[PDB]
């Protein structure tokens, strides 16, 4: 899961 | 002064007590907070609850034979009113006990230390008005993106922003960002304020206004948010936490675009997501105006479904958390959704389908449209 | 005994509603923690002009057959939870099921699923049903099981109380249950296939309850007892339950003969009043009932928590009585009567009290008693609670 | 609480 913040 | 003695309507008292008790603390450390304050004055009964963080108050019409204040157990009072027969409700304080008579039912409760009960917070001045249903809807549409982990308390709240006649709600859990915008009425359009309210407390506080009515929001500066409607007053202690700058997170242009039916897409995502490992990942493949959902593995069982989509741009294969996906879709509240992708590793913009997306021929890069609500979901890495 | 494999892989077209409902009901009887992992699967065997869905966990068995367009006969075993969770979400379209070696392909409308096949070679053949001891109407059977199950114990540590005793004697059936503090006994008429049959089995209350809901409205249920297991059979549905080992007390003797006092009152009225008064009771422990002069005085609580009282008119006959009961037990019984008014039979405060449906024969009770206990189709004895 | 049996 990628992070929205960066 | 004297002991309270009052006669009230069953539905009025049960409604007031019911809503007021909804805010009661689960297990307060100061047992006094577990009580509900009943204050009879002139021609009104003021029911209230308060736990130093949330406040609920309401005055109902009453037949005040004698004025007075009394503090009773909110749990027990609520459970009693809930089962009281549809009959006049007589309340009579005497010594250290409260008599609650309803027709043939006769209850006797112990009184609590009224002196130790703190005063409710004074609501600020009216900062603006919103339709109750729309306000609750917006709060709901954004709440789905708020975090649920007390270790990160900054993600547990909803960013409320006021600037003139426009309001902007935002929420993110570090993997999704929901932003809703709505118009509101204000006699002082020069106000520019920005507060952060706990998401759950803000939804339950939105319940202060019933559908078909208005809600008046009063923002203070310790800061708290006040909500008023149909004689009900509510206050929520603001959340002390910095909110992420969310506007630059949102993309400016999309390399790919899609338009699907919200209902059919939700049904398909929920079908194909059954075989994903603990509902972790779901794969989308867009090409030639056809979406190909696929999930699972050969060890557990694989699922795949093909839906016709209005896709534009270079073909794309991107993975999402089926839960987050369905959560966003559930908030669009529109017939069709319009997706807006860049790369399989960057955010995607779920928003309601507009008139201009239906006829979006070309290959892009397409510009990011304008909409009242956006759900920005971060994708999952593909094997 | 294991399932026999043929030379053909199963290929069949099904109706979504039929297959999904069958898989649903057959799924309810799947084991949470399988004694053998194979048991976790659902068995699909298609033959001629019908498809059978089966599940079995060495204790309970459920098998149902539905119409099916068979393209090729065969047998297959697949994960029951995936089968149910999938069949629930399938679109309302024809269901193509096609097994192909180690994978089973379930295609419905635009959705396509591929599920791994289990070790069908090691799936125990489910038990068969022993003849037909008789036939009971489904509705009445389920109602009776409901009126009795409320008394069954729900503590796994106490298995002798978790069972419902089924007694067969001719064209009449007597169900009974108890948790050691309350006793429920129902009696209903059925159609036995042999005139002078005398049987007495003990079935797990929950399993007999699920089997009770089994059987759609307006149908019948055939019972097949064997010395052992029981066989519930509702048309296409064919389920079996292993019997319970413990012994059931002889409830016949415990039923009082006469009553020093009697009280007839409205079921809904008394129920609502109980629920109101019991709000202030400590963990729902006791309700003080005071019968005297055609008026029931209910009370509960204390100055500690809070004292509640509620009076009701009642057709009372006998010397004034002050008895205390458990609120949950009392409402539990009142809910099973399924009648407009209830009739009570009190011996003493410290001895059980009868709760039976009230009939027209209770429109008036003359004399001071003792009064003779009348014959009822359902009785709910309840043990009182000691007063201060 | 009394008992019916035992
Ligand atoms: N990141
Ligand atoms: N006993």
TrEMBL record, chain C:
Any one of the GO BP annotations: DNA strand elongation involved in DNA replication
Domain DNA polymerase III beta sliding clamp N-terminal per the UniProt entry, residue ranges: 11-127
Cellular compartments annotated: Cytoplasm
Residues covered by the DNA polymerase III beta sliding clamp central domain: 136-250
Keyword Transport (UniProt): no
GO molecular function, a single term: 3'-5' exonuclease activity
UniProt domain DNA polymerase III beta sliding clamp C-terminal: residue ranges: 252-363
GO cellular component: cytoplasm; DNA polymerase III complex
InterPro entries in the record: DNA_clamp_sf (IPR046938), DNA_polIII_beta (IPR001001), DNA_polIII_beta_C (IPR022635), DNA_polIII_beta_cen (IPR022637), DNA_polIII_beta_N (IPR022634)
Family as reported in the entry's similarity comment: Belongs to the beta sliding clamp family.
Quaternary state and interactors: Forms a ring-shaped head-to-tail homodimer around DNA.
Protein name: Beta sliding clamp
Species assigned in the record: Mycolicibacterium thermoresistibile (strain ATCC 19527 / DSM 44167 / CIP 105390 / JCM 6362 / NCTC 10409 / 316) (Mycobacterium thermoresistibile)
Lineage: Bacteria, Bacillati, Actinomycetota, Actinomycetes, Mycobacteriales
């Amino acid at each position: 899961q990628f992070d929205l913040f960066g | 002064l004297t002991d309270l003695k009052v006669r009230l309507v069953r539905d009025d008292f049960a409604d007031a007590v019911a809503w007021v008790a909804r805010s009661l603390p689960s297990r307060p450390t100061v047992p006094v907070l577990a009580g509900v304050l009943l204050t009879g004055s002139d021609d009104g009964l003021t029911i209230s609850s308060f736990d130093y963080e949330v406040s609920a108050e309401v005055q109902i019409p009453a037949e005040i034979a004698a004025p007075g204040t009394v503090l009773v157990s909110g749990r027990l009072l609520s459970e009693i009113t809930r089962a009281l027969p549809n009959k006049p409700v007589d309340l009579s304080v005497e010594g250290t006990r409260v008599s609650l008579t309803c027709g043939s039912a006769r209850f006797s409760l112990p009184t609590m230390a009224v002196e130790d009960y703190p005063a409710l917070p004074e609501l600020p001045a009216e900062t603006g008005s919103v339709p109750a249903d729309l306000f609750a809807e917006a709060i709901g549409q954004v709440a789905v993106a708020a975090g649920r982990d007390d270790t990160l308390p900054m993600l547990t709240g909803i960013r409320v922003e006021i600037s003139g006649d426009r309001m902007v709600l935002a929420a993110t859990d570090r993997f999704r960002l929901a932003v809703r915008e709505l118009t509101w009425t204000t006699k002082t359009p020069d106000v520019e304020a920005a507060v952060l309210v706990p998401a759950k407390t803000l939804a339950e506080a939105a319940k202060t206004g019933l559908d078909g009515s208005e809600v008046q929001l009063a923002l203070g500066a310790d800061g708290l948010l006040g909500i008023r409607s149909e004689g009900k007053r509510s206050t929520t202690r603001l959340l002390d936490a910095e909110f992420p700058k969310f506007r630059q997170l949102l993309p400016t242009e999309h390399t790919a675009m899609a338009t699907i039916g919200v209902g059919e897409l939700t049904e398909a995502i929920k079908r194909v997501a059954l075989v994903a490992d603990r509902g972790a990942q779901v794969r989308m493949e867009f090409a030639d105006d056809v979406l190909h959902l696929s999930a699972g593995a050969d060890d557990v069982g694989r699922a795949e479904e093909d839906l016709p989509v209005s896709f534009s741009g270079e073909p794309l294969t991107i993975a999402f958390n089926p839960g987050y996906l369905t959560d966003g879709l559930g908030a669009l509240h529109s017939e069709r959704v319009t997706f807006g992708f860049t790369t399989p590793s960057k955010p995607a913009v779920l928003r309601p389908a507009t008139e201009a997306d239906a006829a979006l021929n070309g290959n892009g890069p397409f510009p990011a449209a304008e909409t009242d609500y956006v759900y920005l979901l971060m994708p999952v890495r593909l094997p």
